[PDB]
Structures are given as structure tokens and as C-alpha cells.
Amino acid sequence: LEVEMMADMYNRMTSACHRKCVPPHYKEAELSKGESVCLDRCVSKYLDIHERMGKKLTELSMQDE
Amino acid sequence: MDPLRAQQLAAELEVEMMADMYNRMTSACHRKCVPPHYKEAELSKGESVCLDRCVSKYLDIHERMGKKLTELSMQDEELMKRVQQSSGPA
Amino acid sequence: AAELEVEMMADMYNRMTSACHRKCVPPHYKEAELSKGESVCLDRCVSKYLDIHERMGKKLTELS
Amino acid sequence: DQIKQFKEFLGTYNKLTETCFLDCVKDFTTREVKPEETTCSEHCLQKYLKMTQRISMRFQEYHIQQNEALAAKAGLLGQ
Amino acid sequence: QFKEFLGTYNKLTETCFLDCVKDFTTREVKPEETTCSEHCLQKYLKMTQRISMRFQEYHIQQN
Amino acid sequence: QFKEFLGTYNKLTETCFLDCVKDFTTREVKPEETTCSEHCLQKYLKMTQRISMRFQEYHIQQNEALAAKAGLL
Numbered sequence: 001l002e003v004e005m006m007a008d009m010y011n012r013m014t015s016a017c018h019r020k021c022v023p024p025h026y027k028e029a030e031l032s033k034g035e036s037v038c039l040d041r042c043v044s045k046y047l048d049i050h051e052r053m054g055k056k057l058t059e060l061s062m063q064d065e
Numbered sequence: 066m067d068p069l070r071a072q073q074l075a076a077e078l079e080v081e082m083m084a085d086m087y088n089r090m091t092s093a094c095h096r097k098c099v100p101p102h103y104k105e106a107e108l109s110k111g112e113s114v115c116l117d118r119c120v121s122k123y124l125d126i127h128e129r130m131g132k133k134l135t136e137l138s139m140q141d142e143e144l145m146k147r148v149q150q151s152s153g154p155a
Numbered sequence: 156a157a158e159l160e161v162e163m164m165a166d167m168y169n170r171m172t173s174a175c176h177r178k179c180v181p182p183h184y185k186e187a188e189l190s191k192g193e194s195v196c197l198d199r200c201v202s203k204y205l206d207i208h209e210r211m212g213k214k215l216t217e218l219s
Numbered sequence: 220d221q222i223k224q225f226k227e228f229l230g231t232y233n234k235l236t237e238t239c240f241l242d243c244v245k246d247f248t249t250r251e252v253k254p255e256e257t258t259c260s261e262h263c264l265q266k267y268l269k270m271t272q273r274i275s276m277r278f279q280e281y282h283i284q285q286n287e288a289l290a291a292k293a294g295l296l297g298q
Numbered sequence: 299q300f301k302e303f304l305g306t307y308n309k310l311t312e313t314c315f316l317d318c319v320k321d322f323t324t325r326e327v328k329p330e331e332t333t334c335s336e337h338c339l340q341k342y343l344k345m346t347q348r349i350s351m352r353f354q355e356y357h358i359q360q361n
Numbered sequence: 362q363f364k365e366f367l368g369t370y371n372k373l374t375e376t377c378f379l380d381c382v383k384d385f386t387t388r389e390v391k392p393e394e395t396t397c398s399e400h401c402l403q404k405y406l407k408m409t410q411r412i413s414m415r416f417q418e419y420h421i422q423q424n425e426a427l428a429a430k431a432g433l434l
Contacts, residue, residue, distance in 0.1 A: 001300070001301070001304070004301070005301070005304040005305065005307075005308065007365075008304075008305065008308045009308045009311060009312070010416070012308050012309075012311070012312040013312070013315075013412070014408075014409060014412055015312075016312060016315055016316060017408075017412055018405075018408060019316075020319075020320075020322070021322070022404065022408060024380040024381075025397075026380070026381065026397045026400040026401040026404055027400070028155055028400060028404075029152075029155060029399065029400035029403040029404055030152075030155050030403065030404070030407060031404065031407050031408065031411065036411065038322050039408065039411055039412060039415075040325065040411075040415055041322040041323070041324065041325045042319075042322055043412050043415040043416065043419075044325035044326075044415070044419075045315075045319050045322065045325060045326075045327055046315055046319075047419055048326070048327055049311060049314065049315045049318070049319060049327065049335050050311045050315075052335070052336075053307070053310065053311045053314065053335070053339060054307070054311075056336060056339055057307070057339060057343075060343075078363065078364060078367065081364075082364075082367045082368075082371060085367075085368065085371050086371045086374060087278070089371055089372070089374065089375045090274075090278075090374075090375075091271060091274055092375075093375055093378055093379055094270075094274060095238075095267075095270060096379070097379075097382075097385070098270075098385070099266060099270060101242035101243075102259070103242070103243070103259050103260075103262040103263045103266050104262075105262060105266075106261075106262040106265040106266055106269070107266075107269065108266065108269055108270065108273065112270075113273055115385050116270060116273050116274060116277075117273070117277060117388070118385045118386075118387065118388050119382075119385060120273075120274050120277045120278065121277070121388045122382055122385070122388065122389075122390050123374075123378055123382075124278075124281060125389075125390045126374070126377070126378055126381070126382060126390055126395075126398055127374045127378075129390075129395065129398065129399075130370075130373065130374050130377065130398065130402060131370075133399060133402055134370070134402070137406070156222070156225070159222075159225065159226065159229065160229075163229040163230070163233060166230075166233050167233050167236070168353070170233055170236075170237045171237075171349075172345075172346060172349055174237065174240055174241060175349060176342070176345065177241075178244075178245070178247060179247065180341065180342070180345060182317040184317070184318070184334055184337045184338045184341050185337075186337065187336070187337035187339075187340035187341055188340070188341070188344075189341065189344050189345070189348070194348065196247040197345065197348055197349065197352075198250070198348070198352055199247050199248075199249060199250045200244075200247055201349050201352045201353065202250040202352070203240075203244055203247075203249075203250065203251075203252060204240050204244070205353075205356055206252055207236060207239060207240045207243075207244065207252070207260055208236050208240075211232070211235065211236040211239070211260075211264060212232070212236075214261070214264060215232060215235075215264070218268075
């Protein structure tokens with residue numbers, strides 16, 4: 001089940017890095033040096049944020065009991 | 066025995082996809098042609114006009130989208146290596 | 156059919172939440188706790204939503 | 220197909236309920252539907268259906284504009 | 299039915315990322331944002347609970 | 362399998378549409394926009410490819426970190 005629900009955060013993560021790193025002007029058809037970097041950083045920060053959530057949340061799945 | 070159809074039938078996913086695309090397009094023409102006030106219930110003339118044009122334009126843009134798409138597929142032959150020099154280092 | 160009827164009112168439930176999340180909880184998250192305000196809003200938003208839902212059903216079913 | 224007609228019903232339905240509550244309902248200070256909202260939505264629900272209609276009528280000049288030609292490759296034979 | 303918690307888990311992560319991570323300079327979360335996402339989790343969680351309760355308090359009326 | 366791609370596809374169609382098409386005085390895809398579309402199509406694929414990469418570079422970086430464990434003892 002780690003697949004059907006991984007390929008998900010992927011589409012989510014993609015849709016997201018897109019919004020935050022790609023402006024709707026589409027003046028030029030190839031990635032901007034900067035745009036290229038922004039994506040990278042985003043992709044990473046996205047993954048980071050993704051884990052500590054699974055962690056912090058799991059914590060509160062035990063503690064509560 | 067069995068039918069060799071199963072194979073060529075699935076090929077009909079074009080249908081379960083035109084649906085998906087159908088919705089999309091609908092939702093996009095809505096967001097483009099019908100403002101959220103809903104002053105009145107009938108369609109403002111233009112709203113109907115605008116819907117007419119949107120629904121058209123969307124189709125077109127979707128066809129071209131497809132066209133280009135398959136192009137870049139039968140052309141990954143590192144022919145795209147000749148394309149990466151021609152477009153004038155964009 | 157029953158298998159459906161239920162699952163639908165599960166899609167609704169998610170749409171609804173997505174809604175009231177927007178309508179009531181601002182993207183600031185000053186403090187992890189529900190502001191008295193944000194909590195009240197959230198009660199009505201659910202309420203108001205469910206209404207438009209039962210009413211949307213009738214006016215619609217009445218259309219078929 | 221009649222359940223694949225009750226899968227699209229319920230679906231669309233939810234899709235609508237939402238679209239209206241979102242454009243219309245915007246005053247949160249009452250568990251009651253401010254009438255200025257009770258009307259917006261009621262048109263939304265109509266404006267919508269009437270829209271979802273006009274669209275279709277058009278997407279059908281896509282699947283029909285081509286059959287006038289396949290009803291032609293039908294003429295060389297019988298008739 | 300465990301495919302509910304996970305989708306909702308992604309639905310969540312995405313969101314918090316969206317509202318909490320603004321401006322990208324390095325590939326490691328800034329403290330300011332660090333807390334932001336943390337709270338976004340609690341807030342959002344409580345929320346789904348309340349809504350959930352207020353939902354149950356509906357079927358009672360009809361039943 | 363193949364659905365995932367068409368699914369993406371259809372989502373691209375949309376996204377590029379709303380960001381590219383804007384003037385609705387005619388029925389023909391205005392030329393200035395018929396372009397945005399194309400760049401949007403390209404720019405996009407180019408984006409997914411990149412993101413994809415860094416994603417692997419994340420697993421093969423999260424794979425080597427298991428190896429470390431496998432050496433302390």
C-alpha cells in the first residue's frame with residue numbers, strides 16, 4: 001500500500017512545486033536557471049515537511065492513548 | 066480458448082478518458098464564463114456566447130496539446146539533440 | 156446500490172471539509188489551538204453546508 | 220448501463236452542491252442561510268445545469284460534424 | 299478502510315506545505331516555517347474532529 | 362499504468378488552458394496564446410522530469426543511509 005499512497009504525495013508534491021516555482025507567464029519554453037533551482041529546493045523542503053508530519057502525527061497516535 | 070478482444074477492447078480507455086477530459090473542460094469553461102454572483106438564473110447572452118467560444122477553444126488547445134505530445138515521443142531519438150541546438154539556445 | 160449510496164456521502168464529507176477549511180481556518184496558523192472565533196464559524200459552516208446539501212438534493216431529485 | 224447513470228448522478232450532484240456552497244455561501248455568523256445566499260445558490264444550481272447543457276450541445280458538434288462524412292463513406296455502397 | 303487515513307495524510311502534508319513554506323533559498327526548512335507546519339497539523343487535526351462531531355450531531359435529528 | 366499518463370495528460374490540458382487562454386472574443390485560439398500553450402506544455406514536462414530526478418536522488422540517498430547503519434556493527 002506504500003505505492004498507491006506514495007505516487008499520491010508525488011502528484012501532490014508535483015502540483016505544489018509547480019505552483020511555487022513556476023509562474024503562468026510561460027514566456028520561454030525551457031526552464032529558467034532560477035526556476036531550475038527553486039524546483040530543487042522545493043522538492044526537498046517538500047520531502048522534509050512530508051516526514052516530520054508522519055512522525056509528529058504518529059507521536060500523537062500513541063501519546064493520546 | 067478466449068477472445069483476443071480483451072486486448073483491443075481496453076484500447077477504449079479513450080472513452081473513460083474523454084469523460085475525465087470532458088469534466089475538466091466543463092469545469093474550466095465554467096470558471097471562465099460564468100461569474101460567481103449568479104445575478105440571475107438564465108444564462109446571460111454573452112455567458113452563452115463565452116461558453117460557446119470557451120468550449121471550442123478548449124477542444125482546439127487540447128488537440129494541439131496532443132499533437133505536440135506524440136511528436137515529442139517519436140522524436141526522443143536524440144534527434145531532440147538537433148532540436149536543442151536549433152531553437153537558438155532558449 | 157447501498158455500497159454506493161454510502162461511499163458518496165463520504166465524497167461529500169471530504170468536499171465539505173475542504174470547503175469549511177477554506178471558509179473558516181485562515182492560512183496563518185498563529186497558534187496550534189482553535190481560536191474561539193475559528194471554532195464557532197466552523198460549526199455554522201458545516202451546518203449551512205449540510206442544508207444547501209439536503210435542499211440541493213430535493214430541488215434536484217424533483218428535477219428527475 | 221443504469222448504475223453507471225447513478226454513479227454520474229450522485230457524483231455530479233456532490234460536484235454541484237459544492238460549487239454552489241463555495242461561490243454563494245460566504246457569511247459565517249449564522250447557522251441559518253442568509254436569504255441573500257439562498258438565492259445566489261438557487262440560481263447557481265440552475266445557471267449550472269443550463270450551462271452543463273449548452274456545453275454538451277456543443278461538444279456534440281464535434282462527434283456529429285465527423286459523422287456527416289462517415290455517413291458519406293456509407294454512400295458509396297448501399298443506398 | 300485504511301486508504302482513508304493515508305490519502306488524508308497526503309491531503310494534509312500538501313496543504314501545510316502550501317500554506318507554510320513560502321520563499322525558497324536553501325534546501326532545509328527555516329525555523330519560522332518549522333513551527334508553522336507543526337501547528338498546521340494540530341490545528342487541521344482538531345478541525346477534522348469538530349467537523350466530524352458536528353456531523354454526527356446531524357443524523358441524530360432525523361433519527 | 363497507461364491511465365496514469367492520460368490522467369496526467371488531461372490535467373495538463375486543463376492547467377495549460379486556464380493559464381494560457383484568456384481573451385474570448387472569437388472561436389479561434391488566438392495566436393499569442395496558441396504559443397503560451399506550447400511553452401506551457403514543454404516547460405511542464407521539463408519540470409516533471411527534473412522533479413522526478415531529485416526524487417530518485419532522494420531514494421538512492423535514502424538507500425545509502427541504510428548501508429551506513431549496516432556498517433557501524
